[PDB]
Design an enzyme around this catalytic site. Structure first.
Site, mmCIF file in Angstrom:
data_model
loop_
_atom_site.group_PDB
_atom_site.id
_atom_site.type_symbol
_atom_site.label_atom_id
_atom_site.label_comp_id
_atom_site.label_asym_id
_atom_site.label_seq_id
_atom_site.Cartn_x
_atom_site.Cartn_y
_atom_site.Cartn_z
ATOM 1 C CB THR B 40 -19.254 -33.128 -5.219
ATOM 2 O OG1 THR B 40 -20.230 -33.153 -4.254
ATOM 3 C CG2 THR B 40 -18.900 -31.537 -5.503
ATOM 4 C CB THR B 49 -18.817 -36.230 6.209
ATOM 5 O OG1 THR B 49 -18.705 -35.497 4.821
ATOM 6 C CG2 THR B 49 -17.864 -37.504 6.018
ATOM 7 N N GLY B 54 -20.703 -38.836 16.722
ATOM 8 C CA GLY B 54 -19.802 -39.512 17.845
ATOM 9 C C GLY B 54 -18.377 -38.836 17.888
ATOM 10 C CG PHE B 122 -17.520 -44.530 20.783
ATOM 11 C CD1 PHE B 122 -17.966 -44.815 19.560
ATOM 12 C CD2 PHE B 122 -17.874 -43.243 21.193
ATOM 13 C CE1 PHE B 122 -18.677 -44.178 18.743
ATOM 14 C CE2 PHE B 122 -18.852 -42.527 20.373
ATOM 15 C CZ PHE B 122 -19.272 -42.997 18.878
ATOM 16 C CD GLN B 243 -22.062 -50.662 11.998
ATOM 17 O OE1 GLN B 243 -22.072 -49.212 11.595
ATOM 18 N NE2 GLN B 243 -20.979 -51.181 12.635
ATOM 19 C CG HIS B 245 -26.486 -46.802 14.932
ATOM 20 N ND1 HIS B 245 -25.416 -46.814 16.066
ATOM 21 C CD2 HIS B 245 -27.312 -45.688 15.386
ATOM 22 C CE1 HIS B 245 -25.793 -46.013 16.853
ATOM 23 N NE2 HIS B 245 -26.935 -44.940 16.478
ATOM 24 C CG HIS B 356 -25.131 -46.339 10.958
ATOM 25 N ND1 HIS B 356 -25.131 -44.848 11.135
ATOM 26 C CD2 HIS B 356 -23.950 -46.700 11.435
ATOM 27 C CE1 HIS B 356 -23.925 -44.519 11.607
ATOM 28 N NE2 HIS B 356 -23.023 -45.440 11.561
ATOM 29 C CB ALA B 403 -15.642 -43.178 16.664
HETATM 30 C C1 LIG Z 1 -25.303 -41.608 8.317
HETATM 31 C C2 LIG Z 1 -24.377 -41.485 9.394
HETATM 32 C C3 LIG Z 1 -23.018 -41.969 9.245
HETATM 33 C C4 LIG Z 1 -22.020 -41.631 10.372
HETATM 34 C C5 LIG Z 1 -22.433 -40.592 11.671
HETATM 35 C C6 LIG Z 1 -23.734 -40.519 11.833
HETATM 36 C C7 LIG Z 1 -24.746 -40.783 10.506
HETATM 37 C C8 LIG Z 1 -26.011 -40.004 10.781
HETATM 38 N N1 LIG Z 1 -21.752 -40.528 12.647
HETATM 39 C C9 LIG Z 1 -20.265 -40.955 12.405
HETATM 40 C C10 LIG Z 1 -19.268 -40.859 13.417
HETATM 41 O O1 LIG Z 1 -19.694 -40.090 14.301
HETATM 42 N N2 LIG Z 1 -18.060 -41.212 13.272
HETATM 43 C C11 LIG Z 1 -17.485 -42.075 12.081
HETATM 44 O O2 LIG Z 1 -16.600 -42.365 11.957
HETATM 45 N N3 LIG Z 1 -18.649 -42.334 11.152
HETATM 46 C C12 LIG Z 1 -20.054 -41.828 11.511
HETATM 47 N N4 LIG Z 1 -20.814 -42.012 10.266
HETATM 48 C C13 LIG Z 1 -20.533 -42.904 9.203
HETATM 49 C C14 LIG Z 1 -19.540 -42.143 8.203
HETATM 50 O O3 LIG Z 1 -19.672 -40.620 8.548
HETATM 51 C C15 LIG Z 1 -19.796 -42.142 6.661
HETATM 52 O O4 LIG Z 1 -19.415 -43.127 6.318
HETATM 53 C C16 LIG Z 1 -19.380 -41.060 5.817
HETATM 54 O O5 LIG Z 1 -20.062 -39.871 5.764
HETATM 55 C C17 LIG Z 1 -18.794 -41.281 4.478
HETATM 56 O O6 LIG Z 1 -18.147 -40.203 3.941
HETATM 57 P P1 LIG Z 1 -17.659 -40.308 2.456
HETATM 58 O O7 LIG Z 1 -16.897 -38.981 2.012
HETATM 59 O O8 LIG Z 1 -16.948 -41.345 1.938
HETATM 60 O O9 LIG Z 1 -19.052 -40.114 1.618
HETATM 61 P P2 LIG Z 1 -20.200 -39.005 1.964
HETATM 62 O O10 LIG Z 1 -19.734 -37.952 2.944
HETATM 63 O O11 LIG Z 1 -21.563 -39.369 1.879
HETATM 64 O O12 LIG Z 1 -19.872 -38.055 0.482
HETATM 65 C C18 LIG Z 1 -20.554 -38.331 -0.907
HETATM 66 C C19 LIG Z 1 -20.297 -37.370 -1.843
HETATM 67 O O13 LIG Z 1 -20.173 -38.003 -3.245
HETATM 68 C C20 LIG Z 1 -20.907 -36.970 -4.068
HETATM 69 N N5 LIG Z 1 -21.257 -37.335 -5.459
HETATM 70 C C21 LIG Z 1 -20.834 -36.934 -6.456
HETATM 71 N N6 LIG Z 1 -21.384 -37.555 -7.559
HETATM 72 C C22 LIG Z 1 -22.241 -38.578 -7.194
HETATM 73 C C23 LIG Z 1 -23.093 -39.328 -7.793
HETATM 74 N N7 LIG Z 1 -23.204 -39.246 -9.028
HETATM 75 N N8 LIG Z 1 -23.746 -40.395 -6.787
HETATM 76 C C24 LIG Z 1 -23.679 -39.953 -5.361
HETATM 77 N N9 LIG Z 1 -22.876 -39.047 -4.657
HETATM 78 C C25 LIG Z 1 -21.952 -38.449 -5.711
HETATM 79 C C26 LIG Z 1 -21.871 -36.176 -3.251
HETATM 80 O O14 LIG Z 1 -22.156 -34.977 -3.656
HETATM 81 C C27 LIG Z 1 -21.686 -36.258 -1.817
HETATM 82 O O15 LIG Z 1 -21.042 -35.141 -1.115
#
Ligand SMILES: *Cc1cc2c(cc1C)nc1c(=O)[nH]c(=O)nc-1n2C[C@H](O)[C@H](O)[C@H](O)COP(=O)(O)OP(=O)(O)OC[C@H]1O[C@@H](n2cnc3c(N)ncnc32)[C@H](O)[C@@H]1O
Ligand SMILES: C/C=C/CC/C=C/CC/C=C/CCCCCCC(=O)OC[C@H](COP(=O)(O)OCCN)OC(=O)CCCCCCC/C=C/C/C=C/CCC
Ligand code: HEM
Ligand SMILES: O=C(Nc1cccc(Oc2c(F)c(F)c(F)c(F)c2F)c1)c1ccccc1C(F)(F)F
Ligand code: SF4
Ligand code: F3S
Ligand code: FES
EC number: 1.3.5.1
Lengths: 239, 613, 138, 102
Positions: B40, B49, B54, B122, B243, B245, B356, B403
């Site tokens: 990570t 996350t 929501g 929702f 998407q 939002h 979003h 959600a």
């Molecule tokens: C933007 C957003 C999305 C969201 C939300 C509110 C906001 C402001 N509210 C939600 C809700 O209430 N209910 C729901 O079901 N979804 C909601 N969303 C969407 C959802 O949260 C996202 O799809 C979700 O956050 C995605 O989770 P995921 O685990 O798949 O991805 P991540 O949380 O963004 O973590 C990415 C990690 O990857 C690591 N990493 C390591 N190496 C890399 C490289 N090289 N490049 C990019 N990332 C890398 C990072 O460190 C990160 O921790």
């Protein structure tokens, strides 16, 4: 056009025999965002890309951009710049921390202390897990408000002077509050031995109610109140 | 090349990404008994996350008595019939099972008088297969539900011997002869390069929201695993489906939850009329995310703005009781106070449709296995898995229901772990990688470290973000998309003319944001080319020129007294896109959607129909 | 890796490297709660040093207490300087006494909010002046 | 798992409220019996007070062992000095009384 001055802490580990110094940047406040993080990003993009800092959500809900701005410890995306141009904003990293590069401190010890308190539910019998939902009444749920909202920005712990002098053996406001969180979590059966874990002079009892933790918290939480609340439980538990 | 120290690590399973999906896969593998290494670039808590506000959908039946098969119908209806129904079956059935699992782990869910998990109304959901009114099945921890989800997943992950590579930027996939071997990663902490080989690899890097100028996603959500898959010559699915939002703050582009609309929030224009009753009759302002945003972005084109330049709409929370906002929605009450500088209990919040969610990503079956396209068919890539936002099991299809993404994380993250536990054992032969492998990923890194050009990283990034914002908006026509396509193509050629400043090994942010830029561009090309080629309006992708919904049959009228269209004639199919990294050329083809469920007797297949809530 | 190992590897990396420690007291914003806690330590040490120098003088120095009081009346009688030295004894004592109660109220859990802390901080500060002047002239 | 650090903390708070109650008790009732009780509480609370200062600043085991032992010697000397003063000389109650009216 209004020009604001930003004096920022700078250190490069790659530069041969470099000493830590300050560097000032000039920024127009009409072509820039309201928050301090926006200004840091602006000089990152254009003026000086050597500048190094932690950032993610720009929303104040991840705790990456935690740093020292003009005295206190707050999130850079939550703190807005003082429009008073007659002052020069001085930006430092979190106090009494090993600097990796510029505004990036080593938080490895901070995370490691959070592991030692075990921040997860512990039941006496887990043969019925994954099928049932544990009941927690509305009144028992309300006792978590103020505790679960912690983001682990490490502002409160690094605002503690007793954490500067004893950062190795004292857990600090942030970690200590999370211990308390899992204590009155009425779904946790291991409340007693969690308190028994703090039975040494340093772990909890290096707190002297300086209240710098409560004051600096960017989320408005009250860590100091929680530590004092543990102290009471520590004197009032048997066996 | 003699300059960089190569440190080889050996493991059983590697999970690239420590978000919601990444953690569930990471600790779930070590729960089974695998030597698991988690990579990570952020600290697990800082992952995007936490921004989730929501809730997480489960058919527990806490408000009113509920059945999970209704949540199946709602998701596939929301997917505009591009969602693969084998995945949607598995997710909606494991929905009450996963949430109970999370509550048992330590997630401090909000509670009712019954003492059970608090569910909420929702957008997109309905009871009795879209007949029995509004559905209440959105489980939430007040408004910091996603933040608390990531914390109670992290805390629980310390219970197992999972190794963590905190602040390690994953560069490229270790690939040999169409088989996944692991990842090559740069350690930001000191500057070294590490090759982490394992029998299985999970890619969970999240979305690529940073491709656009205005988005609710974090500065780290650049979608790099998507590009890592791309650079391996593997296809990417449905990348045009972005998407928008509806409810995002006009200022910084921050997000206020759909839970605002779920409790009883109303959207108000300059006229004062409830304008969402004008478009949507039955569901109103609590409909699909593509429906509400479509109304908003069209209301601005008329001239009915509400700002200093008439460009945004209003979300009103004036009528709701003050005690309701303090208990149910405190997270949005404080964030709207800072960025907008506006109170919640009396004053309305300025809202604007912004980028979003990305439903597109890495092609994936219901088990979590990464799929490639060979001979017009579906082949499984050995030892490569994907879950979460970066993945595309197409459980969301053309439009994600609110959600469901947190559910997508916990269910498919767990499914990735269970698929590995069955296919191979802990202690099986770890495939040996070549001595001269991944050196081109280092060579790519070395150029950008000493980059000396005419355009900087930031300037070329701004040219990409603004071009995607103006061209690939909510509404898009062929002529506008084509001008954008050749404009994005020109910028990819300009990636050889870039200038960098920082030459340091320890924490080179000037270098890693350029590494993100390469990955953003690759995610931008497939988005814009996939959008311009798609000559239909389906879900979030809406063409002004072609507002027709093109399926195999014309489902608006009677069935079977009708001619069935050929495969290369209709548009009810997934968009698989390849892009030659060397020249920046996009070549794309298509594969059919999965209509069959996991059990017809247990869950009936829902045929395509007229879609309007 | 365990929680104890993570800490042990933290100190071995940082102490054996050319990393600088970030400025703390040199730049941190001065506040009343922080300053009032330092004074409680300052008065605590000063009062113990006064008591210790009173007990040790009873053992390691000749003459009774009555002889020392007759010795006190050396440089005249001190017009108002006898009040100043009497104020210098009671002032650090009274601060510590009133501030000590505030600490005892805190250990019960009461008055641990920022608005309450600044209020009761002034209450201790004002009572110190009134009780010290009130007892010095007696 | 014997709870020793908690009882020490409780012990600190008990002698603090005792000394706070013994100041008006000495003023209202100044006697030979009050002298020893005030001497006992004053030297105990003081010793435990410095013990916190020592455990906060004195870093490392090398100097910490001598600091606690060096303090203990001073605390015993201070308590013995007061008990000698109360039994043989004027007494700490009357000593302040004579000192104040000068
Ligand atoms: C933007 C957003 C999305 C969201 C939300 C509110 C906001 C402001 N509210 C939600 C809700 O209430 N209910 C729901 O079901 N979804 C909601 N969303 C969407 C959802 O949260 C996202 O799809 C979700 O956050 C995605 O989770 P995921 O685990 O798949 O991805 P991540 O949380 O963004 O973590 C990415 C990690 O990857 C690591 N990493 C390591 N190496 C890399 C490289 N090289 N490049 C990019 N990332 C890398 C990072 O460190 C990160 O921790
Ligand atoms: C170790 C001791 C070293 C001596 C120095 C410490 C002096 C500071 C004490 C401040 C308290 C002042 C008490 C008021 C007073 O003047 O007592 C006279 C009165 C006359 O009687 P009366 O019959 O009430 O007189 C009639 C008037 N109402 O009351 C008394 O009888 C005396 C009672 C005082 C007891 C308090 C002792 C506190 C010692 C603190 C040590 C701090 C070290 C620095
Ligand atoms: C009767 C009035 C007094 C009260 C109510 C009182 C109360 C307290 C309390 C509760 C503490 C501990 C603060 C904490 O860490 O929570 C403290 C600190 C201390 N006190 Fe007192 N005390 C009194 C008088 C004295 C006297 C006369 C002396 C001198 C012998 C003294 C010496 C000390 C010392 C050395 C400390 C250590 C400072 C620290 O806690 O860091 N106290 N006082
Ligand atoms: O000293 C305590 N605070 C503290 C807070 C801030 C600074 C500090 O150093 C000082 C100081 F005070 C001064 F006057 C100076 F001129 C100076 F140059 C310092 F470096 C001590 C303190 C107070 C009460 C209980 C526990 C403490 C503890 F644990 F040690 F942190
Ligand atoms: S209690 Fe507040 S200051 Fe401390 S880590 Fe948590 S959010 Fe940060
Ligand atoms: S800032 Fe430090 S002293 Fe205790 S109440 Fe506070 S943790
Ligand atoms: S960057 Fe997320 S808190 Fe400032």
């Amino acid at each position: 056009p209004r020009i604001k001055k930003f004096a920022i802490y700078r250190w490069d580990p790659d530069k041969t025999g470099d000493k830590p110094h300050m560097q000032t940047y000039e920024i127009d406040l009409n072509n820039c965002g309201p928050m301090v993080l926006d200004a840091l990003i602006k000089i990152k993009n254009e003026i000086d890309s050597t500048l190094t800092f932690r950032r993610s959500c720009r929303e104040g809900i991840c705790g990456s951009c935690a740093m020292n701005i003009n005295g206190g410890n707050t999130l850079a995306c939550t703190r807005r710049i003082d429009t008073n141009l007659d002052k020069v904003s001085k930006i430092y990293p979190l106090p009494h921390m090993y600097v990796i590069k510029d505004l990036v401190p080593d938080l490895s010890n901070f995370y490691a202390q959070y592991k030692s308190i075990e921040p997860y539910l512990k039941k006496k019998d887990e043969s019925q897990e994954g099928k049932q939902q544990y009941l927690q009444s509305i009144e028992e749920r309300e006792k978590l408000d103020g505790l679960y909202e912690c983001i682990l920005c490490a502002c409160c712990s690094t605002s503690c002077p007793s954490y500067w002098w004893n950062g190795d053996k004292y857990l600090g406001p942030a970690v200590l509050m999370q211990a308390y969180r899992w204590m009155i979590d009425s779904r946790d059966d291991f409340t007693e031995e969690r308190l028994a874990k703090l039975q040494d002079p340093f772990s909890l009892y290096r707190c002297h109610t300086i209240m710098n933790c409560t004051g600096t918290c960017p989320k408005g939480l009250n860590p100091g109140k929680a530590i004092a609340e543990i102290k009471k439980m520590m004197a009032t538990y048997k066996e | 090349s003699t300059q960089y120290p190569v440190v080889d690590h050996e493991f059983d399973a590697v999970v690239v990404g420590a978000g919601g999906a990444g953690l569930r896969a990471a600790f779930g593998l070590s729960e089974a008994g695998f030597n698991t290494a988690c990579v990570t670039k952020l600290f697990p808590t800082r992952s995007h996350t936490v921004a989730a506000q929501g809730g997480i959908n489960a058919a527990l039946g806490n408000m009113e008595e509920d059945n999970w098969r209704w949540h199946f119908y709602d998701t596939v209806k929301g997917s505009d019939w591009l969602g693969d129904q084998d995945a949607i079956h598995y997710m909606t059935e494991q929905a009450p099972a996963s949430v109970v699992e999370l509550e048992n782990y330590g997630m401090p869910f909000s509670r009712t008088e019954d003492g059970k998990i608090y569910q909420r109304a929702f957008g997109g959901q309905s009871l009795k297969f879209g007949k029995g009114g509004q559905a209440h099945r959105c489980c939430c921890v007040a408004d910091r539900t996603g933040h608390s989800l990531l914390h109670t997943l992290y805390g629980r992950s310390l219970r197992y011997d999972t190794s963590y590579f905190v602040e390690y930027f994953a560069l490229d996939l270790l690939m040999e002869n169409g088989e996944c071997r692991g990842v090559i990663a740069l350690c930001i902490e000191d500057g070294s390069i590490h090759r982490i080989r394992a029998r299985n690899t999970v890619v969970a890097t999240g979305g690529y929201g940073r491709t656009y100028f205005s988005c609710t996603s974090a500065h780290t959500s650049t979608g790099d695993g998507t590009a890592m898959v791309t650079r391996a010559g593997l296809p990417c699915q449905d990348l045009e489906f972005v998407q928008f939002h509806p409810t995002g703050i006009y200022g910084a582009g921050c997000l206020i939850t759909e839970g605002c609309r779920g409790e009883g929030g109303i959207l108000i224009n300059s006229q004062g009329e409830r304008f969402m009753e004008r478009y949507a009759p039955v569901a109103k302002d609590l409909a699909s995310r593509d429906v509400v945003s479509r109304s908003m972005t069209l209301e601005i084109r008329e001239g009915r703005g509400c700002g200093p330049e008439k460009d945004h709409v209003y979300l009103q929370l004036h009528h709701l009781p003050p005690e309701q906002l303090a208990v149910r929605l405190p997270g949005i009450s404080e964030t709207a106070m800072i960025f907008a500088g506006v109170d919640v209990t009396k004053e309305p919040i300025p809202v604007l449709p912004t980028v979003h969610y990305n439903m597109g990503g890495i092609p994936t079956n219901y088990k979590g296995q990464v799929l490639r396209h060979v001979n017009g068919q579906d082949q499984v890539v050995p030892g490569l898995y994907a879950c979460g936002e970066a993945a595309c099991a197409s459980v969301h299809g053309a439009n994600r229901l609110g959600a469901n993404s947190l559910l997508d994380l916990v269910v498919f993250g767990r499914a990735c772990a269970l698929s590995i536990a069955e296919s191979c054992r802990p202690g099986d032969k770890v495939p040996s990688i070549k001595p001269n492998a991944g050196e081109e990923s280092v060579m790519n890194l070395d150029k950008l470290r000493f980059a000396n050009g005419t355009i900087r990283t930031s300037e070329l990034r701004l040219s990409m973000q603004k071009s995607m914002q103006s061209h690939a908006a909510v509404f898009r026509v062929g002529s506008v998309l084509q001008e954008g396509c050749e404009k994005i193509l020109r910028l990819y050629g300009d990636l050889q003319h870039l200038k960098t400043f920082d030459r340091g090994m320890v924490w080179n942010t000037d270098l890693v944001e350029t590494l993100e830029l390469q990955n953003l561009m690759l995610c931008a090309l497939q988005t814009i080319y996939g959008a311009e080629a798609r000559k239909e309006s389906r879900g979030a992708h809406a063409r002004e020129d072609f507002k027709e919904r093109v399926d195999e049959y014309d489902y608006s009228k009677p069935i079977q007294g009708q001619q069935k269209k050929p495969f290369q004639e209709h548009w009810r199919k997934h968009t698989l896109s390849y892009v030659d990294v060397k020249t920046g050329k996009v070549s794309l083809e298509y594969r059919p959607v999965i209509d069959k469920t996991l059990n017809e007797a247990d869950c009936a297949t829902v045929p395509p129909a007229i879609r309007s809530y | 890796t365990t929680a104890k190992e993570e800490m042990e590897r933290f100190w071995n990396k940082n102490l054996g490297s050319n990393r600088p420690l970030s400025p703390h007291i040199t730049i941190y914003r001065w506040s009343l709660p922080m300053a009032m806690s330092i004074c409680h330590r300052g008065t605590g040490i000063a009062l113990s040093a006064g008591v210790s120098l009173f007990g040790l003088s009873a053992l390691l120095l000749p003459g009774n207490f009555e002889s020392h009081l007759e010795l006190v009346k050396s440089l005249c009688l001190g017009p108002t300087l006898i009040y100043t030295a009497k104020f210098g004894i009671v002032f650090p004592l009274m601060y510590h006494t009133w501030n000590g109660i505030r600490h005892l109220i805190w250990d019960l859990g009461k008055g641990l909010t920022i608005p309450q802390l600044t209020q009761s901080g002034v209450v201790v500060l004002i009572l110190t002046v009134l009780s010290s002047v009130g007892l010095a002239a007696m | 798992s014997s709870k020793a650090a908690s009882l020490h903390w409780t012990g600190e708070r008990v002698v603090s409220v005792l000394l706070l109650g013994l100041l008006p008790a000495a003023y209202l009732n100044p006697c030979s019996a009050m002298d020893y009780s005030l001497a006992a509480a004053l030297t105990l609370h003081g010793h435990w007070g410095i013990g916190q200062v020592v455990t906060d600043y004195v870093r490392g085991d090398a100097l910490q062992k001598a600091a606690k032992a060096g303090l203990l010697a001073l605390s015993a000397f201070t308590f013995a000095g007061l008990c000698y003063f109360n039994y043989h000389d004027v007494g700490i109650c009357k000593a302040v009384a004579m000192l104040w009216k000068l």
